[PDB]
């Protein structure tokens, strides 16, 4: 019989009823490596920590493809006013620091 922290009672035969409660022992360890943290919370909560693990990689995937849609757009505006006219001297800050494509010619 699965016993949670709320409790459970059982009567066997003509015996009086007996109640038992479940403590929060667990198996893992929360102060450690990220594989040890997830394992401890998976045993304590096997219904919430599998949703927040999928949610946290859903926001990270959304925020990564939002940023690279804005970092690559910015780098595409570094090149279009300089690659059109190759006679213009490209400044040394835009070659490596502000945008990735270096100097030439």
């Amino acid at each position: 019989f699965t016993v949670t922290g709320e409790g459970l009672e059982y009567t066997w035969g003509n015996h009086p009823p007996k109640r038992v409660w479940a403590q929060e022992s667990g198996e893992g360890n929360p102060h450690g490596w990220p594989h040890e943290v997830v394992v401890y919370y998976y045993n304590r909560y096997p219904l919430t920590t599998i949703i927040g693990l999928c949610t946290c990689v859903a926001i990270i995937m959304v925020s990564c493809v939002t940023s690279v849609w804005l970092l690559c757009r910015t780098r595409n505006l570094c090149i279009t006013p300089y690659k059109l006219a190759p006679n213009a001297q490209v400044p040394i800050l835009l070659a490596l620091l502000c945008c990735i494509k270096p100097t030439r010619a």
Binding site: W21, E24, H31, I59, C64, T74
Partner: protein
């Protein structure tokens, strides 16, 4: 002085509070419940039991005919058999051959056992709730008397005056109609005294255990006595009350939620755990001492020695203090992070004292007040070895009681860094727009 608060609806867990009259020393307060009984109002409709069909002596006309009228009896039956020619001891009973008549009437009534075991049918309505409180305050010992759980009525205990507030939940385990058979209570529906299908529950419906009028349909039907034997036979369906005692499920005192043990003599529902009960207590004015006749402590530093998750008092802490004089003053933690086992301490001039506490957090951040002076306590706790205990939890687990310090560092990294990775992206489009705007002129 009057102190109002809200206590939860748990039986064995005491509620601790520190009343603060201005100009006077604080007084410790402890309210504990013993019973919590919900008593619905019931009215009996009918009882039911096993029947017992009696058969009167038939008349045996030797040659003729005897008809019967209609008698005011439950499930009364008449049928006349013609040409029986019965035999008894000492030769044949009748002479007129092949023209005879037997009466053979039958009649259904309550059994002798119906005064002992009978299922009682009720409809319930919302009624009174009452409890039994345990009260101590200051140096006064424990006092107890049963109160009524309505805001309006006060019940004095000792020299105090308690008004237990109304329950915040109108939940009750009883349905609209209940059946009380013997020891246990069943949630059931009735045939409503008019109907009964002869084999399920209402084949004998009597409004009172000593009532005269009786309803019974048992499909009674008489048969022909055979081979010249003086007897009255009948076939009828078996009892529905005898069938119900075999095919009944689990009673309400094994199905009811919140651990409501069901009692019987007022038909209560004892010791449920749902909602919260507000309180209001009139502490006597003679229990408050003046604040100048009490010790005044200062320079408190608290270090938690050992802590754990456990349901019982698994934490130990020590407090180093310095006081002006020697005396007693109560301790109390106003937060919900921990509860305190002790109620008061005996102080001296610059000593130390220890106390026991219970908590559900990994890192407790509670504070406690001793001698109207507060001090904060922090520490770390360990998982307990025991898997299952046989006592309820003293503390109350919150939403953030499980997150450790290392787990919250990964929350802030996964939130702070990825949100700032869009701020770098958002500040990038506002810079090259400024660069291309400056290229326009």
């Amino acid at each position: 002085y009057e102190h109002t608060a809200v206590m939860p609806n748990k039986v064995g867990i005491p509620y601790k509070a520190l009343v603060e009259r201005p100009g006077y020393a604080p007084v410790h307060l402890q309210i504990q419940l013993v019973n919590t009984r919900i008593i619905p109002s019931t009215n009996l409709e009918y009882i039911t039991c096993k029947y017992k069909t009696k058969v009167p002596s038939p008349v045996v006309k030797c040659c003729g005919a005897t008809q019967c009228t209609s008698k005011p009896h439950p499930d009364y039956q008449c049928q006349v058999f013609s040409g029986v020619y019965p035999f008894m001891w000492g030769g044949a009973y009748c002479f007129c051959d092949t023209e005879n008549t037997q009466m053979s009437e039958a009649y259904v009534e309550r059994s002798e056992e119906c005064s002992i075991d009978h299922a009682k049918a009720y409809k319930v309505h919302t009624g009174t709730v009452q409890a039994m409180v345990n009260i101590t305050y200051g140096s006064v010992s424990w006092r107890s008397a049963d109160v009524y759980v309505n805001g309006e009525t006060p019940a004095k205990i000792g020299d105090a005056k308690l008004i237990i507030g109304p329950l915040s939940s109108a939940w009750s385990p009883f349905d609209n109609k209940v059946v009380v058979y013997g020891h246990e209570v069943y949630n059931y529906d009735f045939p409503e005294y008019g109907t009964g299908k002869a084999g399920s529950f209402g084949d004998l419906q009597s409004r009172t255990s000593t009532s005269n009028d009786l309803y019974a349909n048992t499909n009674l039907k008489l048969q022909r006595p055979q081979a010249g034997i003086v007897h009255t036979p009948f076939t009828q369906v078996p009892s529905g009350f005898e069938r119900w005692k075999k095919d009944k499920g689990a009673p309400l005192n094994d199905v009811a939620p919140f651990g409501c043990s069901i009692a019987l003599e007022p038909l209560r529902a004892e010791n449920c755990a749902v909602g919260s009960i507000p309180i209001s207590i009139d502490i006597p004015d003679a229990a408050f001492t003046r604040i100048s006749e009490t010790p005044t402590v200062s320079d408190l530093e608290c270090k938690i020695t050992e802590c754990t998750y456990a349901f019982d008092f698994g934490g130990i802490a020590t407090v180093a203090y310095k006081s002006s004089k020697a005396g007693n003053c109560p301790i109390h933690s106003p937060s919900g992070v921990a509860v305190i086992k002790e109620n008061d301490v005996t102080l001296a001039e610059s000593g130390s004292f220890t106390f026991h506490f219970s908590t559900a957090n990994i890192h407790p951040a509670f504070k406690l007040q001793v001698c109207t002076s507060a001090v904060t306590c922090k520490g770390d706790c360990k998982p307990p070895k025991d898997h299952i205990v046989d006592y309820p939890a003293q503390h109350t687990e919150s939403f953030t009681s499980a997150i450790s310090a290392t787990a919250w560092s990964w929350i802030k990294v996964l939130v702070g860094g990825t949100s700032a990775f869009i701020v770098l992206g958002l500040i990038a489009t506002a810079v090259v727009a400024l660069v291309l705007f400056f290229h326009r002129h």
